[PDB]
Amino acid sequence: CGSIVPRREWRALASECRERLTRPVRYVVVSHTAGSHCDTPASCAQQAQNVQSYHVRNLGWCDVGYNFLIGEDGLVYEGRGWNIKGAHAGPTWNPISIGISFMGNYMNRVPPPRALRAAQNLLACGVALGALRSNYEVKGHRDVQPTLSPGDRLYEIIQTWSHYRA
């Protein structure tokens, strides 16, 4: 499901994280990377590489912090996946959430419809696989942490999603 781009396909470094999420997960936190935007499979694969590079080598993390990344190419990029706890929303929310991050800065841009489609489809695939609860709740990154993420315009959109709860 999701036609998710797997780790090796975007040339990811090997994970070394061990902490597992306890399925089914009840929460989904939507962020933005506040990094560069990308609109092709080649450029978004490079961008997921860059995001992981910063988390791995500079911040010293066991892997890219997000469970999944959404490109403006309309594709979902595998981060830590469904079963591995992320590092994207702080110690309160990391073990009870799935963190999906839109690659870009969305204070003054909206992501394209195909990016939003990929995100909602990804969440449906998480329900189908048992990784998410049927009644999962979507939160903005700014609703759980002091941050402008996921950006004003993207935040406006996710507030209209049927599973969003402030």
- Residue 82 is given by DSSP the state S
Q: Which of residues 87-146 bind its own copies (CB under 8 A)?
A: 112-114, 117-118, 120-121, 124
Q: How many residues bind its own copies (CB under 8 A)?
A: 21
Q: Sort 75 into a burial class: Cβ within 10 Å, 0-12 / 13-18 / 19+.
A: buried
d(CA 105, CA 87): 19
Chain centre distance of CA 76? 9
Q: Which does 87 bind (CB under 5 to 8 A by kind): Cl ion, its own copies, none?
A: Cl ion
Residue 56 Cβ, how far from its own copies at the closest point, in Å? 24
Side chain identity at 165, as an amino acid letter? R
Q: Which two tokens stand for residue 13?
A: 């470094």
Q: Does 51 bind Cl ion (CB under 5 A)?
A: no
Q: Does 75 bind its own copies (CB under 8 A)?
A: yes
Site for Cl ion, rule CB under 5 A: 61-62, 87
Site for its own copies, rule CB under 8 A: 1-5, 9, 39-42, 73-75, 112-114, 117-118, 120-121, 124
